Scaffold this active site. Structure first.
Site, PDB file in Angstrom:
ATOM      1  N   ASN A 129      44.229 -30.258  27.504  1.00  0.00           N
ATOM      2  CA  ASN A 129      43.261 -29.654  28.416  1.00  0.00           C
ATOM      3  C   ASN A 129      43.846 -29.455  29.814  1.00  0.00           C
ATOM      4  O   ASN A 129      43.091 -29.321  30.784  1.00  0.00           O
ATOM      5  CB  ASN A 129      41.981 -30.505  28.476  1.00  0.00           C
ATOM      6  CG  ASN A 129      40.787 -29.761  29.090  1.00  0.00           C
ATOM      7  OD1 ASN A 129      40.927 -28.697  29.694  1.00  0.00           O
ATOM      8  ND2 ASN A 129      39.599 -30.332  28.926  1.00  0.00           N
TER       9      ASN A 129
ATOM     10  N   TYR B 155      46.188 -16.339  32.462  1.00  0.00           N
ATOM     11  CA  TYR B 155      45.133 -17.191  31.935  1.00  0.00           C
ATOM     12  C   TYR B 155      44.570 -16.678  30.616  1.00  0.00           C
ATOM     13  O   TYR B 155      43.815 -17.403  29.961  1.00  0.00           O
ATOM     14  CB  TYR B 155      44.015 -17.321  32.969  1.00  0.00           C
ATOM     15  CG  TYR B 155      43.118 -18.516  32.760  1.00  0.00           C
ATOM     16  CD1 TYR B 155      43.549 -19.791  33.095  1.00  0.00           C
ATOM     17  CD2 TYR B 155      41.840 -18.372  32.239  1.00  0.00           C
ATOM     18  CE1 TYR B 155      42.737 -20.889  32.912  1.00  0.00           C
ATOM     19  CE2 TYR B 155      41.018 -19.467  32.051  1.00  0.00           C
ATOM     20  CZ  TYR B 155      41.473 -20.722  32.390  1.00  0.00           C
ATOM     21  OH  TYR B 155      40.663 -21.819  32.209  1.00  0.00           O
TER      22      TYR B 155
ATOM     23  N   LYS C 100      45.947 -18.890  27.061  1.00  0.00           N
ATOM     24  CA  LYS C 100      44.810 -19.384  26.295  1.00  0.00           C
ATOM     25  C   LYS C 100      44.774 -18.832  24.881  1.00  0.00           C
ATOM     26  O   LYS C 100      44.250 -19.497  23.981  1.00  0.00           O
ATOM     27  CB  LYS C 100      43.495 -19.044  27.005  1.00  0.00           C
ATOM     28  CG  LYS C 100      43.213 -19.887  28.239  1.00  0.00           C
ATOM     29  CD  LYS C 100      43.566 -21.346  28.026  1.00  0.00           C
ATOM     30  CE  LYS C 100      42.801 -22.232  28.991  1.00  0.00           C
ATOM     31  NZ  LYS C 100      43.129 -23.670  28.805  1.00  0.00           N
TER      32      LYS C 100
ATOM     33  N   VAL D  47      30.739 -21.087  31.909  1.00  0.00           N
ATOM     34  CA  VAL D  47      30.017 -22.353  31.917  1.00  0.00           C
ATOM     35  C   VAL D  47      29.757 -22.760  33.361  1.00  0.00           C
ATOM     36  O   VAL D  47      30.697 -22.892  34.154  1.00  0.00           O
ATOM     37  CB  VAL D  47      30.781 -23.456  31.162  1.00  0.00           C
ATOM     38  CG1 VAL D  47      32.248 -23.485  31.576  1.00  0.00           C
ATOM     39  CG2 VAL D  47      30.130 -24.808  31.400  1.00  0.00           C
TER      40      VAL D  47
END
Lengths: 307, 584, 286
Positions: free
Chosen positions: B63, B134, B138, B166
């Site tokens: 993470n 990014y 990912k 989120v």
């Protein structure tokens, strides 16, 4: 949780109860050392434990665990200089031991449930090998803990009583009365001596003791040998300090709180999720839909099965 | 990376677990101050510390996250891209490889590669402009899972997580950034339009950086497009900002000049600082607020439930997912459901060179690279010269020996300069600059990799961990098969009329099963890269369409049957290249 | 054959999938997505979505000269009349067969295609809902089905033109959905099954309605019909190679999943039509 902890069960001739306790403690991923008081019972215990029923450890979710198997030693409480030698031997084998479930000597202390008809023939064995025996074992363990100080949580010594078959348990009552005080006076002395620099300088820093009792001779049902396992495994593998000495089972298990736990922690986790909702299921009589309906009803919702 | 935050969160978590009635001795938790993730060699100390304090590793959660420099592809420096990829992608395999040999003997292994839903999804490379790194880093975090689940074996599990937007920064920095990029866009369009009709930046640069729009409009001694841009700024733009009177800023000046330098529009020794420093209120806050509302509303309009999830929901969903013992190599969506404008892989879409279309790029300059597939390159050269009659063809080569081999292989297209070769020595920038200087400016650049696949094994149990693909090889594979494409595309991004066409190797014949996972890795990562780049290249004033083409899984499907029958792929390669190289 | 495609080499039981489903039921933040309670299988996919750019192959063009082609449909009048024109002029097909499910449309199509009346190639017959009987007569007339052209007789019902509302009075009801399923899914199965029965009658299912996001409660409608035809061709394709008869089943859709897709341009959809004529002349038979 008892992953890094070793639980030695101070058993006796009670093969069935001790093996059940060993299974319910090994279900908490812990190594065990099952010491039996009388001879001619070690081999029966080995034969019984050989079977896969008690030779495999599965946790409370029903998942098998590769925990260490059940060792077997011979202990003689009434006979000093041999129990201490075995204590030091199992020290050298594994290390310090802190959890000690202490069970009584014999299943039924006398063949007849009476106290005055006898003429000193079996009550001598009782008062000499089940009261004194316990006292000797208590010191045997106390010395192992104090002669060899080990900085950790407080020391745990459960004192499970014998079960009831008929005519109550007059002897269990006697042992209980002797135990409650032994636990009470000890707990106090131990906690007082944990701060004194006089005894602290002996080796390293030691830890106190916290003991209890788990009376069972009042409940006569089928789950009293599984309720007792739950209470023995909860006061050891957790951090729960009971402020009261003696604990007692309910005269009725399903009567007060009926709960059945065949290692079903999933259904416990799935509790009150969908509460107060009505669900309509199609073909929910056998298959995936039936299981969805089962788990939804266990969740709390309302179901309507149609097939 | 920081210590105080970690200490505080450990305090909170240990309090929570102490209230949870566990035999806690403050041993369930630990910290590692300064555990920066962008350095690879320092991870071994962390692994050793973990296996010393605890004993082993069972759950590995990758993470570590790096948003990136947050600009468009055509603006990024190589160092920022390398830092993003190392701190985001390679750090997963480093720990995975360092822990796998002990992990195999455990049996309850699990590797979680936390990704972002904006990175992509299986068979659809969704766009995500201005955050190319990014998205690439990912998509790689799930390409690794999909390519390694089969080989990791039954004892180890491996999946990914893709949470979208989120939240329970207000995009103020994002608003300032989009405004500044808008500025770089109209200014770049102005000069382009000016230089498009008999003008040169040489005489256009001195008065350009004076940041005096009134003087620009009044002088009228300059090409029209910048004058109309100045008039439009004078009319439309807000009057409560320095922008109303000044044009550039301390950032959009150096960056823009660099853009021109990189694109070859402006030569060297032509860079200077700002003579006049515009005041502090360059952009009226009202504009920042309006852009913030616009961004927010555009982001929030994609939700089906018309609300956003919070970190707690996604954390709970991931934690409940970690207890599944029958799922491997699948991407989970803890809290999703959104509307997207994505693209789907065609899988050999049918197409041929249509008549009356060809000869458009006749007498032009074409661009290609490569040294691994020599016969492929020579075949392309023959098909480009026999029919198209191309004026100039440039084929840069990694090494001089391969250059001599190619020269001997052709030996018939010389004496005209069409067949021109040149060494690279791993420096794409030098070769591309020499091409922009002496050679022409080809449009259809091809990102053909210089070197072949690693060609090694990655599946083994405990006790045999020598021939396995280690972190060094993996870094080499990422640098030569992912970062190389980014370098070529970005350096060729700032070209007028570029037709960048990324090409991933068609592997080879008689291939093992182990090397049928790096191929999928490259597929997915390049898919995300090209999707993001193509999305960016549409708004950007100049439109350079990027089209990825792969020849893997094309009638092969891991089925070994290749007795002769090469002409099929020989014709399919040229069909595809010519088809994607000729739009309209 | 099974258990050899599983990464963990372990088959889950009903309890795991039930537990995963029950835990997923309480998300309260997801919708319109497919969950996977326990799956790591290796079947991958032999069929994936593709596109087309045009330029039909010349080698696979002249091989259909002097053949027989079967086509059905009446709702796409211009599409069919041009199809016939292209099939007779450039394709130079020997025989063209047209199926019509009503008499008024039969007369209208006869009037439209009277340009080929002298040749007599085009044939229009007043069939009905018994599509099996109609194709049986079509093949009993002469020859056997070849490049079967699948086309719904009527466009998707969308009679109420609403998948949801605020008063619940003008929304697509159960009867209209049953009609849509029977005419846009079951009809294709019926035609294809018959096409499969005739060996070499390669059937190419098509999704005529190019509904766009601009058309509310119609775009996703186009999306669902596409997905269902995809499912139909996927399984059918597997049974056609192993079995002796060779009937490749292809599904071509024009209602692209590009939101609004093409805009509302009057007289500027002839390019999209030409793309369709290209798609239909490709695939099918060489």
């Amino acid at each position: 949780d008892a992953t890094g902890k070793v639980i030695l069960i101070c058993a006796g001739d009670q093969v069935d109860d001790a093996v059940a306790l060993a299974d319910t403690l090994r279900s908490c991923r812990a190594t065990v050392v099952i010491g039996f008081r009388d001879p001619r019972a070690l081999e029966k215990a080995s034969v019984l434990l050989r079977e896969p029923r008690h030779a495999l450890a599965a946790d409370m979710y029903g998942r098998p665990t590769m925990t260490a198997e059940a060792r077997l030693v011979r202990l003689d409480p009434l006979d000093p200089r041999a129990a201490a030698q075995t204590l030091e031997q199992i020290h050298a084998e594994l290390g310090a031991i802190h959890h000690a479930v202490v069970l009584p000597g014999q299943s039924r202390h006398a063949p007849s449930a009476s106290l005055i008809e006898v003429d000193d023939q079996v009550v001598e064995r009782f008062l000499h090998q089940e009261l004194v025996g316990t006292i000797a074992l208590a010191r045997e363990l106390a010395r192992f803990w104090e002669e060899y100080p080990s900085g950790s949580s407080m020391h745990r010594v459960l004192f499970v009583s014998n079960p009831d078959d008929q005519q109550g348990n007059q002897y269990s009552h006697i042992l209980r009365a002797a135990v409650e005080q032994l636990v009470r006076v000890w707990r106090h002395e131990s906690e007082y001596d944990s701060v004194n620099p006089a005894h602290q300088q002996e080796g390293q820093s030691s830890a106190a003791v916290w003991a209890n009792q788990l009376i069972r001779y009042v409940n006569n049902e089928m789950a009293n040998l599984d309720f007792t396992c739950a209470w023995v495994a909860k006061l050891l593998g957790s951090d729960r300090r009971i402020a009261e000495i003696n604990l007692y089972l309910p005269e009725e298990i399903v009567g007060t709180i009926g709960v059945h736990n065949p290692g079903f922690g999933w259904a416990e986790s799935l509790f009150g999720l969908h509460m107060g909702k009505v669900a309509l299921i199609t073909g929910g009589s056998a298959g995936i839909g039936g299981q969805i309906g089962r788990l939804l009803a266990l969740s709390g919702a309302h179901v309507m099965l149609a097939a | 990376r920081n210590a105080d935050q970690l200490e505080q969160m450990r305090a909170s978590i240990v309090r929570e677990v102490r209230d949870a009635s566990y035999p806690d001795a403050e041993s369930r938790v630990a910290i590692f101050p300064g555990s920066d993730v962008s350095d690879i060699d320092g991870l071994e100390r962390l692994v050793n510390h973990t296996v010393r304090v605890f004993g082993k590793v069972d759950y590995l959660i990758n993470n570590a996250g790096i948003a990136g420099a947050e600009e468009m592809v055509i603006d990024m420096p190589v160092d920022a891209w390398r830092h993003t990829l190392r701190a985001n992608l390679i750090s997963n395999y480093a720990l995975l490889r360092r822990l796998a040999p002990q992990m195999k003997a455990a049996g309850g292994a699990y590797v979680l590669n936390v990704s972002s839903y904006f990175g992509g999804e299986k068979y659809v490379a969704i766009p995500y402009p201005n955050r190319s790194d990014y998205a690439v880093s990912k998509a790689g975090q799930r390409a690794m899972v999909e390519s390694l689940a089969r080989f990791l074996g039954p004892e180890i599990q491996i999946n990914a997580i893709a949470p979208g937007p989120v939240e329970g920064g207000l995009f103020m920095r994002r608003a300032r950034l989009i405004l500044e990029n808008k500025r770089l866009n109209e200014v770049f369009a102005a000069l382009l339009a000016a230089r498009h009709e008999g003008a040169t930046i040489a005489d256009l640069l001195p008065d350009l950086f004076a940041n005096d729009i009134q003087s620009i409009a009044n002088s009228a001694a300059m090409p029209a497009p910048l004058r109309r841009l100045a008039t439009m700024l004078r009319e439309t733009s807000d009057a409560g900002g320095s922008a109303q009177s000044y044009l550039m800023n301390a950032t959009i000046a150096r960056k823009l000049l660099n853009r021109l330098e990189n694109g070859g529009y402006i030569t060297l020794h032509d860079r200077r600082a700002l003579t006049v420093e515009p005041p502090e209120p360059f952009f009226t806050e009202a504009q920042i607020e309006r852009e913030a509302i616009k961004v927010r509303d555009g982001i929030l309009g994609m939700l089906h439930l018309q609300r956003m999830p919070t970190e707690f929901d996604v954390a709970l969903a991931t934690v409940f997912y970690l207890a599944d013992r029958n799922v491997t190599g699948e991407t989970f969506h803890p809290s999703g459901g959104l509307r997207f404008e994505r693209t789907v892989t065609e899988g050999e879409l049918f197409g041929k060179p249509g008549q009356q279309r060809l000869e458009r790029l006749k007498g032009s300059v074409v661009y290609l690279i490569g040294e691994h597939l020599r016969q492929h390159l020579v075949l392309l050269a023959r098909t480009f010269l026999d029919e198209i009659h191309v004026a100039r063809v440039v084929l840069l080569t990694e090494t001089t020996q391969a250059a001599t081999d190619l020269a001997a292989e052709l030996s018939d297209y010389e004496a005209a300069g069409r067949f021109v070769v040149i060494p690279t020595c791993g420096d794409i920038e030098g070769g591309i600059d020499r091409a922009m200087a002496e050679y022409g400016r080809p449009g259809p650049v091809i990102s053909t990799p210089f070197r072949p696949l690693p060609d090694r094994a990655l599946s083994a149990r405990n006790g045999d961990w020598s021939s396995v693909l280690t972190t060094a090889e993996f870094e080499e594979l990422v640098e030569q098969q992912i970062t190389h494409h980014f370098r070529v595309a970005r350096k060729a991004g700032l070209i007028e009329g570029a037709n960048v066409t990324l090409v991933t190797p068609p592997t080879s014949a008689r291939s093992t099963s182990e090397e049928f996972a790096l191929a999928n890795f490259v597929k997915t990562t390049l898919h995300a890269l090209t999707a993001t780049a193509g999305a960016e290249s549409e708004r950007t004033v100049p439109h350079v369409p990027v089209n990825q083409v792969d020849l893997t899984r094309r009638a092969r499907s891991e089925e070994p049957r290749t007795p002769s029958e090469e002409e099929e792929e020989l014709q399919r390669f040229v069909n595809a290249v010519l088809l994607t190289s000729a739009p309209l």
